[PDB]
């Protein structure tokens, strides 16, 4: 690349990327017992040949109770690892995208239904399960009060993150994103609205960061040095008394000190009474606040739908990388059109080059 | 549908379609021994969820020597049939498209390379094969002169079409398109530039139509009556002394009498010295000529790239159905954008409805 | 031009046009006593530099009572002629469009309000006037029954058309379009729903065509031979018992025999109880019916909004020229984008070439 | 407006604007003796009905020698004022834009040719004139060395700015933009590359700002209090030893103290050996630097071509208003399309509402 920043090659730690465009993680709710299915090969295989330099696989539960739904991906046994490795192998052969995976634990937001099947969370008798959380504070008022995690629970989930990370590297993923955003377990520890613990893992900012930073360090220590481990954050909670940009800056700096390779900057998701001023680029200001206070790449996301918008965000130095989600659902070849509009050569596998 | 013709439900014989939009067949050159691969599940699965009412699988050889390349799909053994049936099953579960397959024999254009691997056709020592044709007339001057087919050769290929058709119906395909276009075997019989036979299968128009009409009747007789069997034609050869629109009208009328369910109207492909006046809708006039002389649905194709162009073709009654190929490679969700521009509700699988 | 038909130079009679794109006439309702104002210089000057090869000025009344509204253009005195000549001179200096004007008489549809001021027609005491028509049959039930025109009335209006044509030629217009469409005076004579006369100007088709053909012949005879005089028609009435495409074909053939230079093919407008199947290219079929039966250029119009749609209409030979109206109101530089989409050089005046 | 910031009503000093979209000044080189012509009515009248809330008329010379070219607008006599007043009156009748004018003196860049007539500046005997500048330093090496301005020259040109401002207010303009950018006279004083004076108007930053700040204060004092007077700046020179963003921040703050109503942030234009990193939004970072240090509205400009890009600039608080130029030449109804893409009601005069 030469004409635009968006499609110029970029170095993410030890990982050489074809460009600065990222496909954000998007849950598909199409797995069986956490095992990726034909849908994921069709869905992720398309994103891998889209032209983006990095594709982040949807939130993947580190243990059965960490899945958002009974239909989410998991990475806690050999059968799930083999299915994901097959998809990574397809991406290696046909696309120019590096494959990353988002390791997650849904915390108090687990055991829920597909978004297109509205209703209350699955009760244990309906095939659901009781959730875990830093504190016994509910997100869904209609379901069971979450189990407050003991010190041994913290070590169990942390080891599950480590084991899922080791499986991911073995399956061929070149980067890992820890899901500390959108109201799931790590975010639940970070924010005072959900963390009311009275030990050293709740209260002050340093206490609320303590367990998420342990997970990051433990994951980084269990992987080879060339593996990239990043953190997706919710920089603010959009609710009174929640996470502030100053605290998220501090957390992002602490993540960098422990070897995080990038910060993926999102917002919201912690409480139902949030008020989010949704609009084009409504989270770009938060990405710029993070980028100006860390020395690792920052990914912006949120209603980024046009190449000229994406390139301005990079050129004006609001972020280092552009992530898109819904624009890629509408047009999975968004990078093709975007590269042409910016004057760069679009990527296309040989099978598709008669349309180029 | 209610706002446009393009996205109003349509009946193709006994086959109820969600709309009048067709994805034209597009060779992928990604098979192994004729067996569909992961690429085809990714490629065809996406087209099946695109919103189109009908997806026509790429040209599939009825026997090993009928493949265009060593990397084309085949439908002459159980392993190939099972792999295609798996893709059809994916379409039945997630998409609203009916699945069709184009049964083909490449004739004198067989045993060639991938289009992105330029070079001469594969010689027999390179893993290629000598081709079959109605007459010993070469398309590629650098390769072997094709073997002119005897009467028993005609019956062998005809039975191969029948067997592939039976396999296709068993694999779940609801429609079959016989490939009588683009310079392959059936087209080679139809045109005087390639058919110089001295028996009852060459010479007059009725002789040149005789063998293609036999294949159609044999295929239609070997399948259940609710199966749709259509014919893709090259209405003209774009070369002096070749097929004329009057002859293609006659052949299309003869196809209807034999039970053909639709006519898919393309042009060209027979000889290398063709001069094609390519441009937006350059084959639509040929589709209107066929439509005005037959009582079965006519599909138009050829540089149809915009919804307003497609809808005008239907409203002005130049054709009954719209086929797209390259526009679907560039944007596999073309029907999504097209439906919105025409004021109709776009189709999207539930996994993607948060982008709708 | 060389890449598309739409932007290839075209010969309209003795007029050499830059392309085949026409801006259809569009009433602006912004005149004072029929005199063009600053609005018309802003509006028509923009259309003249748009890139279209031909701009047709809105329906211009040949006498005060022939105006649709008190705010319509007129061409029956020196002050109106001078104002229009100033606009034609602006077009000559900056644009590549030839200037045409639509000469009209509203007949029984005259003396009405601006479309954005809904209400009954202006009564004579409100500043309106009683209308003239072939028969005493109302379009608006709330207004005065129109005067049925006597023999001297026919001669008077015909002479008004002649005088306006002479003024138009003197002001610099290179083509004239007679408004025989959309339910106005000439159309009122053509259709049996509005013409119930008992003399030689009503009854048979030959009688209903008689007065419109006299106007055409008289206009053609009064102008220099290189002036182009065309006819805009309503090919059908979209009402039971109205004009048929067969009758409009005959009238269009009679127009050519009198020296008409083109047929502009529209539909509707005669009666309020019409049912029009509106949609993209819904009048293109009617244009093709006329084009196949005359040897003068045919202009298609009606929801033509995209370059690929326009080029398909020309390439498939449904019409000889493409007319647009509402697409040019939405984007007055529609030809700029259209030429780029078709691969041709877009026209731009030197003041705007830093955007090219 | 309510759905987007770009099309929400905005307060610019005492001026109520329909939205936050600005049409940037664009020289047309179509005047005669500084008098606006039919071209300017066509061009500026279209911009006034485009939907933008503010239209800035092209750089207008405060005296004959301050014009960039012999074909630029001037505002130093009654005939020029009356012609501009007739355009403002057209805008007031049909559009929703408030009208502003850019008052300028080209300094050492005066007496040049139309951009589409490349060549050396007009010499005095060819109808050109010798230029004035803070120092006898040439921009064009082929022309006469500019006159270094004496104390009376400063007072004379300052009075010319005052007189033109009074004429502009009398002609109906509601805002004035002083042209302190793009290498013209005021910019020539600000930058050390062009200002080498040894008196109190050169040397230190305080000295280089002294004369531009006098012009602003004198213009502000001669107008009514409700008139808006802004400053267009070149925030950096893109050349070694030129203006820095720190210096432009200081100048912008000094402008605010003396009553400037807004800062319009551009860059470059001072020296020919500049190297500008052109790209989408390449001047937005400079606008944000100004916005973060002043309490008056800041306008961003420079390759802003898409609504999502423009809205992101506002929502992420890089600027308060969006200015477009070349995008408005390509599509003068850019605000119409932009409002629809952002979900707001587009503005259209009643004559055009049948296209909405
Ligand atoms: C269908 C869907 C699934 C998503 N799943 C995830 C997820 O698993 N993990 C995550 O961090 N974000 C998820 N998100 C949020 C996106 O990653 C992204 O942050 C959000 O959609 C805003 O970006 P966009 O406007 O480009 O879509 C999902 C979004 C959608 C629409
Ligand atoms: C990559 C590619 C593969 C194709 N393979 C086939 C094929 O197997 N059988 C066939 O009948 N046409 C084939 N075609 C031709 C298309 O079906 C279609 O008729 C042609 O591309 C014109 O349509 P379009 O302009 O919409 O692309 C292929 C076209 C492309 C671009
Ligand atoms: C505002 C407006 C004014 C029009 N005025 C005229 C007219 O004066 N004479 C005429 O023959 N048609 C007139 N028409 C009809 C158009 O010329 C054209 O035939 C019709 O709008 C369909 O074309 P389109 O879909 O491209 O707009 C007008 C249409 C509009 C929207
Ligand atoms: C034809 C043309 C004329 C221009 N004239 C002026 C001018 O008179 N005064 C000025 O400050 N900028 C002028 N400019 C610069 C623009 O105002 C604007 O700052 C620049 O084009 C970048 O914005 P854009 O990318 O939206 O076009 C002109 C630009 C163009 C293309
Ligand atoms: C036939 C009467 C009339 C024509 O409209 C005479 O010119 C009235 O203006
Ligand atoms: C200083 C002389 C001059 C510069 O503009 C002003 O009078 C000449 O017009
Ligand atoms: Cl293990
Ligand atoms: Cl999520
Ligand atoms: Cl083919
Ligand atoms: Cl009309
Ligand atoms: Cl300038
Ligand atoms: Y323990
Ligand atoms: Y920087
Ligand atoms: Y019909
Ligand atoms: Y009379
Ligand atoms: Y022809
Ligand atoms: Y002096
Ligand atoms: Y703020």
mmCIF file of N, CA, C and O in Angstrom, chain C residues 27-30 38-39 41-47 49 86 90 94 115-116 326-333 336-337 340 349-355, chain D residues 27-30 38-39 41-47 49 86 90 94 115-116 326-333 336-337 340 349-355:
data_model
loop_
_atom_site.group_PDB
_atom_site.id
_atom_site.type_symbol
_atom_site.label_atom_id
_atom_site.label_comp_id
_atom_site.label_asym_id
_atom_site.label_seq_id
_atom_site.Cartn_x
_atom_site.Cartn_y
_atom_site.Cartn_z
ATOM 1 N N UNK C 27 -41.366 22.290 -15.320
ATOM 2 C CA UNK C 27 -41.950 23.560 -14.912
ATOM 3 C C UNK C 27 -41.390 24.003 -13.570
ATOM 4 O O UNK C 27 -41.269 23.210 -12.632
ATOM 5 N N UNK C 28 -41.060 25.291 -13.480
ATOM 6 C CA UNK C 28 -40.520 25.858 -12.258
ATOM 7 C C UNK C 28 -41.500 26.756 -11.525
ATOM 8 O O UNK C 28 -41.287 27.028 -10.340
ATOM 9 N N UNK C 29 -42.558 27.217 -12.197
ATOM 10 C CA UNK C 29 -43.595 28.040 -11.574
ATOM 11 C C UNK C 29 -42.990 29.253 -10.874
ATOM 12 O O UNK C 29 -43.389 29.623 -9.767
ATOM 13 N N UNK C 30 -41.999 29.871 -11.521
ATOM 14 C CA UNK C 30 -41.253 30.969 -10.915
ATOM 15 C C UNK C 30 -41.158 32.178 -11.837
ATOM 16 O O UNK C 30 -40.312 33.051 -11.619
ATOM 17 N N UNK C 38 -34.564 35.460 -12.285
ATOM 18 C CA UNK C 38 -33.265 35.000 -11.799
ATOM 19 C C UNK C 38 -33.282 33.502 -11.517
ATOM 20 O O UNK C 38 -32.289 32.804 -11.757
ATOM 21 N N UNK C 39 -34.404 32.991 -11.003
ATOM 22 C CA UNK C 39 -34.497 31.563 -10.725
ATOM 23 C C UNK C 39 -34.203 30.736 -11.969
ATOM 24 O O UNK C 39 -33.504 29.717 -11.894
ATOM 25 N N UNK C 41 -32.430 31.559 -14.673
ATOM 26 C CA UNK C 41 -31.011 31.611 -15.011
ATOM 27 C C UNK C 41 -30.207 30.671 -14.124
ATOM 28 O O UNK C 41 -29.345 29.926 -14.605
ATOM 29 N N UNK C 42 -30.485 30.691 -12.820
ATOM 30 C CA UNK C 42 -29.820 29.775 -11.902
ATOM 31 C C UNK C 42 -30.143 28.330 -12.258
ATOM 32 O O UNK C 42 -29.248 27.480 -12.330
ATOM 33 N N UNK C 43 -31.422 28.041 -12.509
ATOM 34 C CA UNK C 43 -31.851 26.667 -12.755
ATOM 35 C C UNK C 43 -31.413 26.175 -14.132
ATOM 36 O O UNK C 43 -30.767 25.127 -14.249
ATOM 37 N N UNK C 44 -31.756 26.915 -15.192
ATOM 38 C CA UNK C 44 -31.437 26.447 -16.538
ATOM 39 C C UNK C 44 -29.948 26.554 -16.843
ATOM 40 O O UNK C 44 -29.404 25.706 -17.561
ATOM 41 N N UNK C 45 -29.276 27.579 -16.319
ATOM 42 C CA UNK C 45 -27.839 27.676 -16.514
ATOM 43 C C UNK C 45 -27.101 26.493 -15.920
ATOM 44 O O UNK C 45 -26.130 25.998 -16.499
ATOM 45 N N UNK C 46 -27.561 26.016 -14.761
ATOM 46 C CA UNK C 46 -26.958 24.837 -14.150
ATOM 47 C C UNK C 46 -27.162 23.603 -15.018
ATOM 48 O O UNK C 46 -26.231 22.813 -15.215
ATOM 49 N N UNK C 47 -28.380 23.409 -15.530
ATOM 50 C CA UNK C 47 -28.636 22.271 -16.408
ATOM 51 C C UNK C 47 -27.797 22.346 -17.677
ATOM 52 O O UNK C 47 -27.352 21.312 -18.187
ATOM 53 N N UNK C 49 -24.769 23.466 -18.042
ATOM 54 C CA UNK C 49 -23.387 23.078 -17.780
ATOM 55 C C UNK C 49 -23.298 21.701 -17.128
ATOM 56 O O UNK C 49 -22.209 21.270 -16.745
ATOM 57 N N UNK C 86 -31.344 35.614 -23.246
ATOM 58 C CA UNK C 86 -30.232 35.822 -22.325
ATOM 59 C C UNK C 86 -29.779 34.502 -21.707
ATOM 60 O O UNK C 86 -28.578 34.269 -21.526
ATOM 61 N N UNK C 90 -26.185 32.445 -22.144
ATOM 62 C CA UNK C 90 -25.396 31.880 -21.055
ATOM 63 C C UNK C 90 -25.037 30.430 -21.344
ATOM 64 O O UNK C 90 -23.899 30.004 -21.116
ATOM 65 N N UNK C 94 -20.948 28.738 -21.692
ATOM 66 C CA UNK C 94 -20.376 27.933 -20.623
ATOM 67 C C UNK C 94 -20.662 26.442 -20.716
ATOM 68 O O UNK C 94 -19.887 25.652 -20.171
ATOM 69 N N UNK C 115 -47.938 23.627 -7.759
ATOM 70 C CA UNK C 115 -48.145 22.303 -7.152
ATOM 71 C C UNK C 115 -47.962 22.290 -5.645
ATOM 72 O O UNK C 115 -48.589 21.468 -4.966
ATOM 73 N N UNK C 116 -47.140 23.176 -5.091
ATOM 74 C CA UNK C 116 -46.974 23.229 -3.646
ATOM 75 C C UNK C 116 -47.964 24.172 -2.976
ATOM 76 O O UNK C 116 -47.847 24.422 -1.772
ATOM 77 N N UNK C 326 -36.354 14.203 -12.676
ATOM 78 C CA UNK C 326 -36.209 14.259 -11.225
ATOM 79 C C UNK C 326 -34.803 13.891 -10.769
ATOM 80 O O UNK C 326 -34.322 14.437 -9.770
ATOM 81 N N UNK C 327 -34.122 12.989 -11.483
ATOM 82 C CA UNK C 327 -32.740 12.681 -11.130
ATOM 83 C C UNK C 327 -31.837 13.899 -11.287
ATOM 84 O O UNK C 327 -30.843 14.031 -10.565
ATOM 85 N N UNK C 328 -32.168 14.802 -12.214
ATOM 86 C CA UNK C 328 -31.390 16.022 -12.387
ATOM 87 C C UNK C 328 -31.758 17.097 -11.374
ATOM 88 O O UNK C 328 -30.944 17.985 -11.112
ATOM 89 N N UNK C 329 -32.966 17.050 -10.809
ATOM 90 C CA UNK C 329 -33.283 17.929 -9.687
ATOM 91 C C UNK C 329 -32.531 17.503 -8.433
ATOM 92 O O UNK C 329 -32.005 18.346 -7.700
ATOM 93 N N UNK C 330 -32.480 16.196 -8.169
ATOM 94 C CA UNK C 330 -31.760 15.685 -7.006
ATOM 95 C C UNK C 330 -30.264 15.955 -7.125
ATOM 96 O O UNK C 330 -29.627 16.421 -6.174
ATOM 97 N N UNK C 331 -29.684 15.650 -8.282
ATOM 98 C CA UNK C 331 -28.265 15.888 -8.544
ATOM 99 C C UNK C 331 -28.135 16.565 -9.902
ATOM 100 O O UNK C 331 -28.116 15.878 -10.939
ATOM 101 N N UNK C 332 -28.030 17.897 -9.942
ATOM 102 C CA UNK C 332 -27.896 18.585 -11.237
ATOM 103 C C UNK C 332 -26.619 18.251 -11.987
ATOM 104 O O UNK C 332 -26.511 18.613 -13.163
ATOM 105 N N UNK C 333 -25.660 17.571 -11.359
ATOM 106 C CA UNK C 333 -24.475 17.071 -12.044
ATOM 107 C C UNK C 333 -24.538 15.558 -12.232
ATOM 108 O O UNK C 333 -23.506 14.884 -12.276
ATOM 109 N N UNK C 336 -22.156 14.040 -14.767
ATOM 110 C CA UNK C 336 -20.770 13.913 -14.327
ATOM 111 C C UNK C 336 -20.517 12.537 -13.721
ATOM 112 O O UNK C 336 -19.636 11.796 -14.170
ATOM 113 N N UNK C 337 -21.303 12.173 -12.705
ATOM 114 C CA UNK C 337 -21.180 10.853 -12.094
ATOM 115 C C UNK C 337 -21.466 9.744 -13.099
ATOM 116 O O UNK C 337 -20.772 8.720 -13.118
ATOM 117 N N UNK C 340 -18.510 9.019 -15.434
ATOM 118 C CA UNK C 340 -17.441 8.305 -14.744
ATOM 119 C C UNK C 340 -17.802 6.838 -14.540
ATOM 120 O O UNK C 340 -16.953 5.955 -14.717
ATOM 121 N N UNK C 349 -17.251 22.705 -16.807
ATOM 122 C CA UNK C 349 -16.710 24.003 -17.190
ATOM 123 C C UNK C 349 -15.400 24.256 -16.477
ATOM 124 O O UNK C 349 -15.144 23.699 -15.393
ATOM 125 N N UNK C 350 -14.527 25.088 -17.052
ATOM 126 C CA UNK C 350 -13.197 25.298 -16.450
ATOM 127 C C UNK C 350 -13.229 25.718 -14.990
ATOM 128 O O UNK C 350 -12.309 25.369 -14.239
ATOM 129 N N UNK C 351 -14.259 26.452 -14.561
ATOM 130 C CA UNK C 351 -14.349 26.864 -13.163
ATOM 131 C C UNK C 351 -14.433 25.682 -12.204
ATOM 132 O O UNK C 351 -14.082 25.830 -11.028
ATOM 133 N N UNK C 352 -14.880 24.516 -12.670
ATOM 134 C CA UNK C 352 -15.133 23.375 -11.798
ATOM 135 C C UNK C 352 -14.126 22.245 -11.967
ATOM 136 O O UNK C 352 -14.286 21.196 -11.338
ATOM 137 N N UNK C 353 -13.093 22.425 -12.788
ATOM 138 C CA UNK C 353 -12.235 21.307 -13.156
ATOM 139 C C UNK C 353 -11.263 20.890 -12.057
ATOM 140 O O UNK C 353 -10.633 19.835 -12.187
ATOM 141 N N UNK C 354 -11.131 21.664 -10.978
ATOM 142 C CA UNK C 354 -10.338 21.208 -9.842
ATOM 143 C C UNK C 354 -11.068 20.166 -9.004
ATOM 144 O O UNK C 354 -10.456 19.565 -8.114
ATOM 145 N N UNK C 355 -12.352 19.937 -9.268
ATOM 146 C CA UNK C 355 -13.084 18.831 -8.671
ATOM 147 C C UNK C 355 -13.092 17.598 -9.563
ATOM 148 O O UNK C 355 -13.645 16.566 -9.168
ATOM 149 N N UNK D 27 -12.915 30.668 -5.548
ATOM 150 C CA UNK D 27 -12.750 31.624 -6.633
ATOM 151 C C UNK D 27 -13.285 31.050 -7.934
ATOM 152 O O UNK D 27 -13.043 29.886 -8.268
ATOM 153 N N UNK D 28 -14.011 31.882 -8.676
ATOM 154 C CA UNK D 28 -14.578 31.476 -9.949
ATOM 155 C C UNK D 28 -13.886 32.099 -11.149
ATOM 156 O O UNK D 28 -14.026 31.572 -12.256
ATOM 157 N N UNK D 29 -13.128 33.181 -10.953
ATOM 158 C CA UNK D 29 -12.385 33.836 -12.032
ATOM 159 C C UNK D 29 -13.300 34.191 -13.200
ATOM 160 O O UNK D 29 -12.941 34.040 -14.370
ATOM 161 N N UNK D 30 -14.503 34.672 -12.877
ATOM 162 C CA UNK D 30 -15.516 34.948 -13.889
ATOM 163 C C UNK D 30 -16.092 36.351 -13.747
ATOM 164 O O UNK D 30 -17.170 36.629 -14.279
ATOM 165 N N UNK D 38 -23.477 36.940 -14.411
ATOM 166 C CA UNK D 38 -24.482 35.881 -14.439
ATOM 167 C C UNK D 38 -23.925 34.574 -13.890
ATOM 168 O O UNK D 38 -24.637 33.826 -13.210
ATOM 169 N N UNK D 39 -22.654 34.279 -14.177
ATOM 170 C CA UNK D 39 -22.054 33.056 -13.658
ATOM 171 C C UNK D 39 -22.160 32.991 -12.141
ATOM 172 O O UNK D 39 -22.473 31.935 -11.580
ATOM 173 N N UNK D 41 -24.361 34.479 -10.157
ATOM 174 C CA UNK D 41 -25.744 34.214 -9.768
ATOM 175 C C UNK D 41 -26.077 32.737 -9.920
ATOM 176 O O UNK D 41 -26.679 32.126 -9.029
ATOM 177 N N UNK D 42 -25.681 32.144 -11.048
ATOM 178 C CA UNK D 42 -25.885 30.715 -11.251
ATOM 179 C C UNK D 42 -25.125 29.905 -10.206
ATOM 180 O O UNK D 42 -25.681 28.994 -9.583
ATOM 181 N N UNK D 43 -23.856 30.251 -9.978
ATOM 182 C CA UNK D 43 -23.012 29.463 -9.086
ATOM 183 C C UNK D 43 -23.402 29.665 -7.626
ATOM 184 O O UNK D 43 -23.690 28.699 -6.911
ATOM 185 N N UNK D 44 -23.432 30.919 -7.166
ATOM 186 C CA UNK D 44 -23.726 31.180 -5.760
ATOM 187 C C UNK D 44 -25.193 30.937 -5.429
ATOM 188 O O UNK D 44 -25.509 30.515 -4.311
ATOM 189 N N UNK D 45 -26.100 31.209 -6.367
ATOM 190 C CA UNK D 45 -27.502 30.913 -6.122
ATOM 191 C C UNK D 45 -27.744 29.435 -5.881
ATOM 192 O O UNK D 45 -28.555 29.059 -5.032
ATOM 193 N N UNK D 46 -27.032 28.578 -6.616
ATOM 194 C CA UNK D 46 -27.152 27.141 -6.402
ATOM 195 C C UNK D 46 -26.648 26.747 -5.019
ATOM 196 O O UNK D 46 -27.289 25.956 -4.317
ATOM 197 N N UNK D 47 -25.497 27.288 -4.612
ATOM 198 C CA UNK D 47 -24.957 26.985 -3.290
ATOM 199 C C UNK D 47 -25.900 27.431 -2.179
ATOM 200 O O UNK D 47 -25.997 26.765 -1.143
ATOM 201 N N UNK D 49 -29.157 27.422 -2.199
ATOM 202 C CA UNK D 49 -30.284 26.501 -2.094
ATOM 203 C C UNK D 49 -29.821 25.062 -1.896
ATOM 204 O O UNK D 49 -30.644 24.145 -1.903
ATOM 205 N N UNK D 86 -27.608 41.839 -5.115
ATOM 206 C CA UNK D 86 -28.652 41.125 -5.842
ATOM 207 C C UNK D 86 -28.513 39.614 -5.687
ATOM 208 O O UNK D 86 -29.513 38.891 -5.765
ATOM 209 N N UNK D 90 -31.265 37.070 -3.784
ATOM 210 C CA UNK D 90 -31.699 35.784 -4.320
ATOM 211 C C UNK D 90 -31.549 34.687 -3.276
ATOM 212 O O UNK D 90 -32.444 33.851 -3.106
ATOM 213 N N UNK D 94 -34.779 32.247 -1.676
ATOM 214 C CA UNK D 94 -34.965 30.855 -2.057
ATOM 215 C C UNK D 94 -34.206 29.847 -1.203
ATOM 216 O O UNK D 94 -34.614 28.683 -1.154
ATOM 217 N N UNK D 115 -6.470 29.865 -13.317
ATOM 218 C CA UNK D 115 -5.759 28.589 -13.135
ATOM 219 C C UNK D 115 -5.767 27.703 -14.367
ATOM 220 O O UNK D 115 -4.832 26.914 -14.548
ATOM 221 N N UNK D 116 -6.781 27.807 -15.225
ATOM 222 C CA UNK D 116 -6.816 27.016 -16.448
ATOM 223 C C UNK D 116 -6.150 27.721 -17.624
ATOM 224 O O UNK D 116 -6.236 27.233 -18.755
ATOM 225 N N UNK D 326 -14.606 21.315 -2.939
ATOM 226 C CA UNK D 326 -14.606 20.523 -4.166
ATOM 227 C C UNK D 326 -15.753 19.520 -4.202
ATOM 228 O O UNK D 326 -16.284 19.231 -5.280
ATOM 229 N N UNK D 327 -16.160 18.984 -3.046
ATOM 230 C CA UNK D 327 -17.319 18.096 -3.032
ATOM 231 C C UNK D 327 -18.587 18.830 -3.453
ATOM 232 O O UNK D 327 -19.494 18.220 -4.029
ATOM 233 N N UNK D 328 -18.661 20.137 -3.193
ATOM 234 C CA UNK D 328 -19.816 20.918 -3.610
ATOM 235 C C UNK D 328 -19.751 21.311 -5.078
ATOM 236 O O UNK D 328 -20.796 21.563 -5.684
ATOM 237 N N UNK D 329 -18.555 21.370 -5.665
ATOM 238 C CA UNK D 329 -18.460 21.540 -7.110
ATOM 239 C C UNK D 329 -18.899 20.275 -7.838
ATOM 240 O O UNK D 329 -19.610 20.346 -8.845
ATOM 241 N N UNK D 330 -18.477 19.110 -7.343
ATOM 242 C CA UNK D 330 -18.866 17.848 -7.961
ATOM 243 C C UNK D 330 -20.369 17.622 -7.853
ATOM 244 O O UNK D 330 -21.032 17.280 -8.839
ATOM 245 N N UNK D 331 -20.925 17.805 -6.658
ATOM 246 C CA UNK D 331 -22.360 17.651 -6.421
ATOM 247 C C UNK D 331 -22.842 18.855 -5.625
ATOM 248 O O UNK D 331 -22.731 18.867 -4.386
ATOM 249 N N UNK D 332 -23.388 19.880 -6.288
ATOM 250 C CA UNK D 332 -23.871 21.056 -5.547
ATOM 251 C C UNK D 332 -25.032 20.758 -4.619
ATOM 252 O O UNK D 332 -25.367 21.612 -3.792
ATOM 253 N N UNK D 333 -25.635 19.573 -4.703
ATOM 254 C CA UNK D 333 -26.653 19.148 -3.753
ATOM 255 C C UNK D 333 -26.107 18.099 -2.790
ATOM 256 O O UNK D 333 -26.852 17.253 -2.291
ATOM 257 N N UNK D 336 -28.039 17.551 0.401
ATOM 258 C CA UNK D 336 -29.245 16.746 0.238
ATOM 259 C C UNK D 336 -28.947 15.272 0.486
ATOM 260 O O UNK D 336 -29.579 14.630 1.333
ATOM 261 N N UNK D 337 -27.971 14.724 -0.240
ATOM 262 C CA UNK D 337 -27.576 13.333 -0.043
ATOM 263 C C UNK D 337 -27.062 13.096 1.372
ATOM 264 O O UNK D 337 -27.382 12.076 1.994
ATOM 265 N N UNK D 340 -29.867 12.714 4.018
ATOM 266 C CA UNK D 340 -30.551 11.427 3.927
ATOM 267 C C UNK D 340 -29.700 10.303 4.507
ATOM 268 O O UNK D 340 -30.213 9.435 5.223
ATOM 269 N N UNK D 349 -35.807 23.617 -2.083
ATOM 270 C CA UNK D 349 -36.784 24.650 -2.413
ATOM 271 C C UNK D 349 -38.023 24.026 -3.020
ATOM 272 O O UNK D 349 -37.966 22.922 -3.592
ATOM 273 N N UNK D 350 -39.178 24.692 -2.910
ATOM 274 C CA UNK D 350 -40.430 24.085 -3.396
ATOM 275 C C UNK D 350 -40.377 23.628 -4.844
ATOM 276 O O UNK D 350 -41.032 22.636 -5.191
ATOM 277 N N UNK D 351 -39.607 24.310 -5.699
ATOM 278 C CA UNK D 351 -39.495 23.903 -7.096
ATOM 279 C C UNK D 351 -38.911 22.503 -7.260
ATOM 280 O O UNK D 351 -39.137 21.871 -8.298
ATOM 281 N N UNK D 352 -38.162 22.006 -6.275
ATOM 282 C CA UNK D 352 -37.453 20.738 -6.399
ATOM 283 C C UNK D 352 -38.042 19.624 -5.543
ATOM 284 O O UNK D 352 -37.485 18.521 -5.520
ATOM 285 N N UNK D 353 -39.154 19.868 -4.854
ATOM 286 C CA UNK D 353 -39.631 18.930 -3.847
ATOM 287 C C UNK D 353 -40.285 17.684 -4.434
ATOM 288 O O UNK D 353 -40.546 16.737 -3.685
ATOM 289 N N UNK D 354 -40.545 17.645 -5.740
ATOM 290 C CA UNK D 354 -41.025 16.415 -6.355
ATOM 291 C C UNK D 354 -39.918 15.388 -6.556
ATOM 292 O O UNK D 354 -40.214 14.240 -6.905
ATOM 293 N N UNK D 355 -38.659 15.769 -6.344
ATOM 294 C CA UNK D 355 -37.542 14.833 -6.334
ATOM 295 C C UNK D 355 -37.192 14.349 -4.934
ATOM 296 O O UNK D 355 -36.262 13.549 -4.784
#
